[PDB]
Amino acid sequence: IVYKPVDLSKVTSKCGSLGNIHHKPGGGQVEVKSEKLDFKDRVQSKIGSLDNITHVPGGGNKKIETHK
Amino acid sequence: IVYKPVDLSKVTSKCGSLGNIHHKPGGGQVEVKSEKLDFKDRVQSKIGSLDNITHVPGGGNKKIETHK
Amino acid sequence: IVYKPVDLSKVTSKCGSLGNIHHKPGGGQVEVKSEKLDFKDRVQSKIGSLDNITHVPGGGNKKIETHK
């Protein structure tokens, strides 16, 4: 009996922002004015002219193999 | 009995924003005026002139290979 | 008995925004005026001129193989 399985296989994930070009991007003025506001539970707020956001919860790899 | 399976295969995920060109992208002025507002539960707010978001929960790979 | 299966397969996914050109995209002026609003439950709000958004929950790959 000769048992010589060969695995050269590639499992690859390229997830998120990759190889992009952003030439001279520009956010104009942002102006937020607030008066007599009332809040009675949690507040999350974000303010800003130019944003570039990447989230990657994904992109995981799994490779299960078995020989008998 | 001679057993010589060969795997050279590829499994590629390529997910999100890839290889894009943004050339002089311009966010205009953004102006937010808020007066006498009442909030009795949770607030999320985002304010901005130019925004670029990539979100990737996906793009995962699974390879399974069994030999008997 | 000789057993020599060869796998050269290329399982591939390309999901989201790929290889686009955005030449001088211009968001306009955005003006939001709010007065005397009541919110008895949760609020989510995005305000802005020029948003690029890519969301990819999908694009995953599964490969199963068995030899007997």
Curated annotation (Swiss-Prot), chains A, B, C:
Using the record's annotations, give every residue carrying the modification N6-acetyllysine. K4, K10, K14, K24, K36, K40, K62
Q: Where is this site: Not glycated?
A: K4, K10, K14, K24, K33, K36, K63, K68
Q: How is it modified after translation?
A: Phosphorylation at serine and threonine residues in S-P or T-P motifs by proline-directed protein kinases (PDPK1, CDK1, CDK5, GSK3, MAPK) (only 2-3 sites per protein in interphase, seven-fold increase in mitosis, and in the form associated with paired helical filaments (PHF-tau)), and at serine residues in K-X-G-S motifs by MAP/microtubule affinity-regulating kinase (MARK1, MARK2, MARK3 or MARK4), causing detachment from microtubules, and their disassembly. Phosphorylation decreases with age. Polyubiquitinated. Requires functional TRAF6 and may provoke SQSTM1-dependent degradation by the proteasome. PHF-tau can be modified by three different forms of polyubiquitination. 'Lys-48'-linked polyubiquitination is the major form, 'Lys-6'-linked and 'Lys-11'-linked polyubiquitination also occur.
**Expressed in which tissues:** Expressed in neurons. Isoform PNS-tau is expressed in the peripheral nervous system while the others are expressed in the central nervous system.
The residues joined by the cross-link Glycyl lysine isopeptide (Lys-Gly) (interchain with G-Cter in ubiquitin) are: K4, K10, K14, K24, K36, K40, K46, K62, K68
Subcellular localization, as worded in the UniProt entry: Cytoplasm, Cytosol; Cell membrane; Cytoplasm, Cytoskeleton; Cell projection, Axon
Q: Which residues carry this modification: Omega-N-methylarginine?
A: R42
Q: Which residues form a coiled coil?
A: none
Modified positions (Phosphoserine) in chain numbering? S17, S45, S49
- Report the superkingdom from the record: Eukaryota
N6,N6-dimethyllysine-modified residues are K4
Annotated Tau/MAP repeats reside at: 1-29, 30-61
Glycosylated sites:
K40, K46, K62
Q: Which residues cross the membrane?
A: none
Q: What does this protein do?
A: Promotes microtubule assembly and stability, and might be involved in the establishment and maintenance of neuronal polarity. The C-terminus binds axonal microtubules while the N-terminus binds neural plasma membrane components, suggesting that tau functions as a linker protein between both. Axonal polarity is predetermined by TAU/MAPT localization (in the neuronal cell) in the domain of the cell body defined by the centrosome. The short isoforms allow plasticity of the cytoskeleton whereas the longer isoforms may preferentially play a role in its stabilization.
Q: Which disease is it linked to?
A: In Alzheimer disease, the neuronal cytoskeleton in the brain is progressively disrupted and replaced by tangles of paired helical filaments (PHF) and straight filaments, mainly composed of hyperphosphorylated forms of TAU (PHF-TAU or AD P-TAU). O-GlcNAcylation is greatly reduced in Alzheimer disease brain cerebral cortex leading to an increase in TAU/MAPT phosphorylations. Frontotemporal dementia 1: A form of dementia characterized by pathologic finding of frontotemporal lobar degeneration, presenile dementia with behavioral changes, deterioration of cognitive capacities and loss of memory. In some cases, parkinsonian symptoms are prominent. Neuropathological changes include frontotemporal atrophy often associated with atrophy of the basal ganglia, substantia nigra, amygdala. In most cases, protein tau deposits are found in glial cells and/or neurons.
* Annotated domain remarks: The tau/MAP repeat binds to tubulin. Type I isoforms contain 3 repeats while type II isoforms contain 4 repeats.
The entry describes its oligomerization and partners as:
Interacts with MARK1, MARK2, MARK3 and MARK4. Interacts with PSMC2 through SQSTM1. Interacts with SQSTM1 when polyubiquitinated. Interacts with FKBP4. Binds to CSNK1D. Interacts with SGK1. Interacts with PIN1. Interacts with LRRK2. Interacts with LRP1, leading to endocytosis; this interaction is reduced in the presence of LRPAP1/RAP.
Give the protein's recorded name.
Microtubule-associated protein tau
Q: Report where the shown chain sits in the full-length sequence: first residue, last residue, total length.
A: 625 to 692 of 758
